[model samples]
Target: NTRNFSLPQLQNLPIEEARIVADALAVHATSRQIDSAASKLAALAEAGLKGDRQAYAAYQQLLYVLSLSDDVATAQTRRWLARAIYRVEERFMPAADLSRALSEEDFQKRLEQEIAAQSRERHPMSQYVFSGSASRAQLQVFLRHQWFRTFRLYRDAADLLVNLTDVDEAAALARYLYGELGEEDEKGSHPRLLAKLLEAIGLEADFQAVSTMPEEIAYLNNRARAFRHAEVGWGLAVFYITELVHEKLYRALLQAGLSEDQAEYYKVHISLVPPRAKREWQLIARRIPDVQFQNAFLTSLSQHFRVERAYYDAIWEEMQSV
Candidate 1:
């Protein structure tokens, strides 16, 4: 019943059209319908990905919808398959939203603001994280989450998700990977900074808390939930963009009294930050010549952030109980 969207409109609409409908369709779709939409909708995008504008628009739109939908793994897997077929990169984790490009002198400023809002919206439950003023209890709280957070840092930028066929996408991921770990992709080696921080905090556990922390599990589920589309756009946004945005978080960690010695984990990543941010924007800018993609791009960015916001919300809520 259109009463609850079978995602009929979302399913039937062309890729670009369907993107604008993401929030609306998501709110109304069934678990099954959303899952079914992945490959099906990907097929729709597959028809157009010319490694050019229309195809990129279609790809971006498809990814935006998937990111917005509920119970989306089924669709995501198919989308991954489509990527394998198309050998495309520069895909959407959520499309870059550039609609309200006003008051934003350049994309760097715009993205900084977009993520800054999310960061502000998600300031730690308490300033306890960095305040040398923080109590042991708060230290425990931060430590407890490290198992999960460290893994999150690494996984988001893992090279496994790189788009091997797309040179730009692959190089971008490689650069992003350096910030996370190194080229070796070892189990515990990369992100020497995060590992060092965990060591300082006495929580250097290699395993993720997915086994015990409901909140940690939820956070990962959220990551798992985003579609890893063909062009690797979704992965790029999820990985690289997230890396760029978190320095603000690093600063917050400093404020919370994270020691300067270990703060390297959260410290300024000069070469990686602005430059990588600029590169991602440049790649996306080239692809989004059409107004249709531009609008859809912004919508996708919102949807992606919304999903990500839920992850932090879950953490905040979970902290209260423990």
Candidate 2:
């Protein structure tokens, strides 16, 4: 079904030629309902080399769907190819198809809605801690878990750091990470500062003894997976969501009766997070060229919302229990 092209032949073509070959191969692969291994590989290689991520992903999806046909060969090589496709799909495909239906402008508009919705949504624990309801004990419990979650934030950024291909993008992320690490002071790391807050509030600051609820672990796992396995652009979107909310989340803490010295961490983040968040959003808006990455970025936001909400839900429930 490949019009006599081979994998090497496809790979050797120039970028534009590769795009043409890949497009033609997609038609052939679709019509036959299952491409020969060479055709499948040729299509995949050509699209990738052409920098056509959407087409590359489409070929992968087609190969995955068509490989299931009775007419498709089940040779050992084909079986392995199918397995490989399955793994890519498992990690990358969930939002790929959904992302393709919207124009970039449309996608950004929709994403803004998602971001705004979150801004409007209240975490009751946030209200409890900032208002009169939460006692010092309940506040300490909340701050301790919040500190642990912040640990995961820096850790997740490190994971995303290695997956990045662009030096400029990496530099942007590094700047954000540097600030999170406390901008050059051993005692300045955001987490370390948070630990001091816990100590000031009588929580003992025993990080090793700090408990992570199931919901917190789930959120951390999801964040780790998005950065580790999905495209770095997807991770940027996740980072954007996290940074955008920190200003307000920390602003609430600023009002929660801590002394000015005790509230420095919240104050620092409240000041820095908005600009860092804006930089990330700008990076994502300007750098994501492929629909596949764009869609992945968009869908990653939804996934973040779900996991983050669950984590907050657990926190609020714990506060009530306390």
Candidate 3:
């Protein structure tokens, strides 16, 4: 409350630069496709804003990370980069609650409709890749997205696991929690398999570019924000919902000629459904604990789906044109 609102977002930096960068992000960089067309941040800096090249460069990277990067734990990247490279729940991230909307039958129906439509659009990457309609490049894009998440696969469970332990000296606590030591050891540690799948397909360069794919980047950023805020039901609802489509896609991959083991990533989703989801719901319900978060959860779930769907359309166009 004491600090001036006009002060710099970075004290070493000028306040004018923050305003300029914020304004640029508000307009030119708001959409995924705009950034998707670039090979690097310089393109966006030159095209999307006015003034100093270096300042715009910072805006480009930070906003890109803000809008869609997710290496919050990866221990990677360039200098002067922000550590928390995840989106906030406020701008389709991190906040609000869901009780009233959850009870509204009509609203719930429409929400479900939107989700289904966005999820099943004609050009959806998941659909075509599984059906074998997608080409090698298209499939490689999908592989990259898988690689992005594999490294951070059980993050939420890990975050939740130990926190559930205790206030008392060993009371209600175990040697370790679900994902770490004992109780939760086999917690869907499935990324390496997906990584091997990428290698099996022979697309390491493409895998490296996964973070740049518009849809994939959007998927990771949205998921990381939601996952990081998982205690909130918003994170739980969105993540849980994403699992519902996995099994079908896995089958599609198998039918498309991927080996059963290669497509085996889907097996984890098999458990994430009713089997694991209910517990998350219970945990999130308790964690979210109120209207603000519940509303935010529903809104974020809807927005993330819609945003990700847009990327599907864009990527599909690229695939089709190719």
lDDT of each: 0.49, 0.60, 0.48
- Measured against the true structure, the TM-scores of the candidates, in listed sequence, are 0.53, 0.65, 0.58
lDDT of 2 by residue, 183-290 (tens): 878689988887777777877654433232656655654565566554666687787776754445455556666776776777776544453356666667675567
TM for candidate 3 is 0.58
Q: Is candidate 1 or candidate 2 better by lDDT?
A: 2
The TM-score of predicted model 2 comes to 0.65
Q: Candidate 2 — which pairs collide? A: none
The numbered model that scores best in lDDT is 2
Q: How would you encode candidate 3's per-residue C-alpha lDDT over 130-180 as one tens digit per residue?
A: 566776677776665556655554554343333343333122222212322
Off by over 4 Å in 3: 1-60, 63-114, 121-123, 156-188, 205-210, 271-277, 284-289
- Ranking by lDDT, best first? 2, 1, 3
Alpha-carbon error at 48 in model 2, in Å? 34
